[PDB]
Amino acid sequence: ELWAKIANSINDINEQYLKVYEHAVSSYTQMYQDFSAVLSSLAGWISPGGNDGNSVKLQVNSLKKALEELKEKYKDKPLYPANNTVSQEQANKWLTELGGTIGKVSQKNGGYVVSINMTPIDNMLKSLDNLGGNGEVVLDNAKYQAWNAGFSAEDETMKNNLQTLVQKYSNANSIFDNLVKVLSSTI
Amino acid sequence: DINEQYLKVYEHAVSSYTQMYQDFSAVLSSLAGWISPGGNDGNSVKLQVNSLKKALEELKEKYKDKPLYPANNTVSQEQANKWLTELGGTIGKVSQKNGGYVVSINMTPIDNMLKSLDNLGGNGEVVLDNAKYQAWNAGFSAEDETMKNNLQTLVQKYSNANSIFDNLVKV
Numbered sequence: 028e029l030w031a032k033i034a035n036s037i038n039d040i041n042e043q044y045l046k047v048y049e050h051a052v053s054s055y056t057q058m059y060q061d062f063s064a065v066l067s068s069l070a071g072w073i074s075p076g077g078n079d080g081n082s083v084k085l086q087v088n089s090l091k092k093a094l095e096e097l098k099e100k101y102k103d104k105p106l107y108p109a110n111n112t113v114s115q116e117q118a119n120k121w122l123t124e125l126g127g128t129i130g131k132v133s134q135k136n137g138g139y140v141v142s143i144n145m146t147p148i149d150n151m152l153k154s155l156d157n158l159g160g161n162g163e164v165v166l167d168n169a170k171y172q173a174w175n176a177g178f179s180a181e182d183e184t185m186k187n188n189l190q191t192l193v194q195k196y197s198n199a200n201s202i203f204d205n206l207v208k209v210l211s212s213t214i
Numbered sequence: 215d216i217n218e219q220y221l222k223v224y225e226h227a228v229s230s231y232t233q234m235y236q237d238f239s240a241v242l243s244s245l246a247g248w249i250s251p252g253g254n255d256g257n258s259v260k261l262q263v264n265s266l267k268k269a270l271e272e273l274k275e276k277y278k279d280k281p282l283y284p285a286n287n288t289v290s291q292e293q294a295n296k297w298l299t300e301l302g303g304t305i306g307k308v309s310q311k312n313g314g315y316v317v318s319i320n321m322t323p324i325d326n327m328l329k330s331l332d333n334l335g336g337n338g339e340v341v342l343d344n345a346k347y348q349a350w351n352a353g354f355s356a357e358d359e360t361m362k363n364n365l366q367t368l369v370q371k372y373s374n375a376n377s378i379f380d381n382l383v384k385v
Contacts, residue, residue: 030385037378045374049302052367056304060322060360067326067353071333073346080256083345171345182352186359193363193370200370204377211381 033210045203048196051106051125051141058101058143059189065093066182076165083171088162091155098148105140106130112138125195129188147181154178216378223297224372227282227317231305234277234319235365241269242358252341259347263340267331274321274328281316282306288314302371305364320364323357330354 072089076082106129107113107121118132118139125141133142154177158164166174245266252260282305283297294308294315306317330353334340342350 033385034382037382049371053302053304056302056360056363056367059356059363060304063323063353063356063360064326066349066356067330068333069353070330070346070349073349075343075346083343175345175348179348179352182356186356189359189363193366197366197370200374204374207377207381211385214385 030214033213037207037210040203040206045199047107047121048199050109051129052192052196054104054106055129055143055189055192058097058104059185061097061100062148062182062185065090065097068093072162076167081168082165083168084163084165085171086162087155087158087160087164090162091152094148094152094155098145098152101143101145103135105133105135105142107141112136112140115139125192126188128184129192147184151178151181216375216382218379218383221372221375221379223283224301224368224375226285227301227305228368228372230277230280230282231319231365231368234273234280235361237273237276238324238358238361241266241273244269256343258341258343260339260341261334261347261350263331263334263336264338267328267337270324270328270331274324277319277321281309281311281318283317288312288316291315302364302367304360305368323360327354327357 069090072086074084076084106125107118112135113121115132115138118141121141122130122132127144129144130141131144131146132139154174158166158174248262248265250260252258282301283294288311291308291314294317298306298308298317301317305320307320307322308315309318330350334342334346334350
């Protein structure tokens, strides 16, 4: 009777709050899986240097291509919203809720979306440019170890992002179920 | 809507992925034992690629016919794709089974682990210097994180569904 009002109000919170979180986790996870595939390929792009014997040979070209394709695939795959677009202020509120580490407000058609923040990949591509080129590059130990400390930084940033996004979605689940109770208690 | 039968689907999916990850963790329990001081000359480690590949291939083989949905039976492509979307489309993969389709456990992380092990040539013990070892570990641990986060998300989805149910079928 007047619980149909509660049913509707709960459903709408699910639609405007929880479903947004579910979709942001799903989009980011898909990007991270693809990034993990790039990481899984890296060991095969690395081999021992030569004249002898403290150096590493890196197929910087194969790595650049893999990172570039990752970026292109996730250009028009927002964290929010799943369909169509929203208003610039609407995107900024969700940016805040999700975090500026995870997302980036970006323009699309007549509106705005919160895209995946690809800055860690952007950072990787820059270093690779500094090398200087084009896959088969030979780096001495200190140089490789320096390039790597930066690249690992990026790979552990994206890992932390995913983990925190999931924790923060785990929270929104608890917050919703809580509300769901507080509104059933009206009966 | 959420049904008493929408939950049955989520409970079985949760249970299947959970079990798969538990078995993967049994592999993690053996890992350090497959790693050892190598060379013997310079800064390197030896990895029993063969033993680890065997454990991963076996985990794949075990879950090959243990779909997330449906437990028993098969559906249309369109219906399977629907549930794949529903589950947070990263945990599962639509695959052909007998006459129809099912939402299988996504084993891509394991396949990637396996491909990387192949990039380490020797179908025997390989010697990895720091650069190569760090690269291998970064990839392997990233694939592991993918599965871990997939499990947590699905468990949260199940928890929610179950909460909505308990309350909207008590009132």
